[PDB]
Design an enzyme around this catalytic site. Structure first.
Site, PDB file in Angstrom:
ATOM      1  N   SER A  67     -12.269   8.962   7.832  1.00  0.00           N
ATOM      2  CA  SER A  67     -13.223   9.053   8.921  1.00  0.00           C
ATOM      3  C   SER A  67     -13.087  10.399   9.623  1.00  0.00           C
ATOM      4  O   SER A  67     -11.988  10.954   9.753  1.00  0.00           O
ATOM      5  CB  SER A  67     -12.998   7.913   9.915  1.00  0.00           C
ATOM      6  OG  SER A  67     -13.822   8.069  11.050  1.00  0.00           O
ATOM      7  N   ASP A  95     -12.228 -10.050  -0.504  1.00  0.00           N
ATOM      8  CA  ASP A  95     -11.199  -9.210   0.108  1.00  0.00           C
ATOM      9  C   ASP A  95     -11.160  -7.868  -0.614  1.00  0.00           C
ATOM     10  O   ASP A  95     -10.608  -7.777  -1.718  1.00  0.00           O
ATOM     11  CB  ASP A  95      -9.849  -9.920   0.054  1.00  0.00           C
ATOM     12  CG  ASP A  95      -8.727  -9.110   0.671  1.00  0.00           C
ATOM     13  OD1 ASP A  95      -9.005  -8.076   1.312  1.00  0.00           O
ATOM     14  OD2 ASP A  95      -7.565  -9.541   0.533  1.00  0.00           O
TER      15      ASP A  95
HETATM   16  N1  LIG Z   1      -6.830  -7.491   2.874  1.00  0.00           N
HETATM   17  C1  LIG Z   1      -5.658  -7.289   2.043  1.00  0.00           C
HETATM   18  C2  LIG Z   1      -4.688  -6.302   2.695  1.00  0.00           C
HETATM   19  C3  LIG Z   1      -3.572  -6.770   3.364  1.00  0.00           C
HETATM   20  C4  LIG Z   1      -2.696  -5.874   3.954  1.00  0.00           C
HETATM   21  C5  LIG Z   1      -2.938  -4.513   3.878  1.00  0.00           C
HETATM   22  C6  LIG Z   1      -1.972  -3.527   4.525  1.00  0.00           C
HETATM   23  F1  LIG Z   1      -1.634  -3.974   5.772  1.00  0.00           F
HETATM   24  F2  LIG Z   1      -0.845  -3.416   3.763  1.00  0.00           F
HETATM   25  F3  LIG Z   1      -2.578  -2.305   4.585  1.00  0.00           F
HETATM   26  C7  LIG Z   1      -4.056  -4.043   3.211  1.00  0.00           C
HETATM   27  C8  LIG Z   1      -4.930  -4.939   2.617  1.00  0.00           C
HETATM   28  N1  LIG Z   2      -5.945  -9.818   4.191  1.00  0.00           N
HETATM   29  C1  LIG Z   2      -5.938 -10.912   3.230  1.00  0.00           C
HETATM   30  C2  LIG Z   2      -5.861 -12.228   4.004  1.00  0.00           C
HETATM   31  C3  LIG Z   2      -7.006 -12.975   4.236  1.00  0.00           C
HETATM   32  C4  LIG Z   2      -6.924 -14.159   4.956  1.00  0.00           C
HETATM   33  C5  LIG Z   2      -5.704 -14.591   5.451  1.00  0.00           C
HETATM   34  C6  LIG Z   2      -5.619 -15.903   6.235  1.00  0.00           C
HETATM   35  F1  LIG Z   2      -6.102 -15.755   7.499  1.00  0.00           F
HETATM   36  F2  LIG Z   2      -6.362 -16.835   5.576  1.00  0.00           F
HETATM   37  F3  LIG Z   2      -4.325 -16.317   6.330  1.00  0.00           F
HETATM   38  C7  LIG Z   2      -4.565 -13.845   5.217  1.00  0.00           C
HETATM   39  C8  LIG Z   2      -4.642 -12.659   4.499  1.00  0.00           C
END
Ligand SMILES: NCc1ccc(C(F)(F)F)cc1
Ligand SMILES: NCc1ccc(C(F)(F)F)cc1
Length: 330
Positions: free
Chosen positions: A199, A35
């Site tokens: 972008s 992630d």
């Molecule tokens: N993948 C993690 C993540 C979850 C939420 C956000 C947001 F919505 F806050 F931008 C960014 C990154």
């Molecule tokens: N963006 C981070 C994230 C990754 C996976 C999930 C889920 F689908 F596993 F719940 C939630 C949040």
């Protein structure tokens, strides 16, 4: 040193990607969601409330001879989709595709939200944003990438996500056989702790490219592409029968439609997302209404270049002292 690991979609829609990670001694192999939008390495464990575990592989620190409890440390994270988890912290040895970090903080979940419990294929997350976002208290901990940086041949990692197919995460080197043409690099702002970039614009199908600055984050941890309302309206307007549905929670389209491609700018270069990547299938089993892969960011507060966009490219996360993002066609 370097590391290389295959990453695999968890279902037929590429909702997420899992990558095997070796934790502890002897190795316990868990499949983690890499992630780039978060900065905690956390896992289902023997400490997780039993009713909240449904098929996940668990990390058992008591069976690792290298695990050490981090005295008094706790963690608690909330993701943008409403998911959350929390627990205590161990340090242990963590290996990804041959690349080993000793003393990595491994956050052991005591509690997880329902969305993680119902996702039997994800044993945890491996955060790859900047360490300023790590939630360990009272002493913030470093990401796997930050811990490995000094020993990597090059301070980079690359994401090569597949469309309905396996892909690769590489650490420490750029595979010049994995992309076509040249890599275009663009400036990154770390001020919010994300891989944040701008972008240079967009096009819909074969339409004219619109030069306009779209500030957003490169997030392997988010499934869809979240862009400003004006852009997303212009895209779905080219799909006969598409409409925004409040009950469903976004844009839907008749499943019989063919979707146009979507192009986004990286400096002077152009990345083309094939229209098929934007189809996320029926909203419910048997439905003839399908869910769109490009949605509005208006409710979120930030634009997100999630997997829909990233899997159309070879992406370089350059963690040099001045960090940059690289995009190439593939
Ligand atoms: N993948 C993690 C993540 C979850 C939420 C956000 C947001 F919505 F806050 F931008 C960014 C990154
Ligand atoms: N963006 C981070 C994230 C990754 C996976 C999930 C889920 F689908 F596993 F719940 C939630 C949040």
């Amino acid at each position: 040193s370097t590391g290389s690991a295959t990453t695999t979609p968890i279902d037929s829609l590429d909702d997420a990607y899992i990558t095997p990670v070796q934790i502890g001694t002897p190795a316990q192999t868990l499949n983690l969601d890499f992630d780039t939008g978060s900065s905690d390495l956390w896992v289902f464990s023997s400490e997780t409330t039993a009713s909240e575990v449904d098929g996940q592989t668990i990390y058992t620190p008591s069976k690792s001879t290298t695990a050490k409890l981090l005295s008094g440390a706790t963690w608690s994270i909330s993701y943008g989709d409403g998911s959350s988890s929390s627990g205590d912290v161990y340090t242990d040895t963590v290996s990804v595709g041959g690349l080993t970090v000793t003393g990595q903080a491994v956050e052991s979940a005591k509690k997880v939200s329902s969305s993680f419990t119902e996702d039997s294929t994800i044993d945890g997350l491996l955060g790859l944003a900047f360490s300023t976002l790590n939630t360990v208290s009272p002493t913030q901990q470093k990401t796997f990438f930050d811990n490995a940086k000094a020993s990597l041949d090059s301070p980079v990692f690359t994401a090569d996500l597949g469309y309905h197919a396996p892909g690769t995460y590489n650490f420490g080197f750029i595979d010049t056989t994995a992309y076509t043409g040249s890599i275009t690099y663009t400036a990154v702002s770390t001020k919010q702790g994300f891989w944040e970039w701008t972008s240079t614009g967009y096009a819909v199908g074969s339409g004219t490219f619109k030069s306009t600055s779209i500030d957003g984050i490169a997030d392997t941890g988010t499934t869809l592409l979240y862009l400003p309302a004006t852009v997303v309206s212009a895209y779905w307007a080219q799909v006969s029968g598409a409409k925004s549905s409040s009950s469903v929670g976004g844009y839907v389209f008749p499943c019989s439609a063919t979707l146009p491609s979507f192009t986004f700018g990286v400096g002077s270069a152009r990345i083309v997302i094939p229209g098929d990547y934007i189809d996320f299938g029926p909203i419910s089993t048997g439905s003839s209404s399908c869910f769109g892969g490009i949605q509005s960011s208006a409710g979120i507060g930030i634009n997100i270049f999630g997997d829909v966009a990233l899997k159309a490219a070879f992406v370089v996360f350059n963690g040099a002292t001045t960090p940059t993002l690289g995009f190439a066609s593939k």
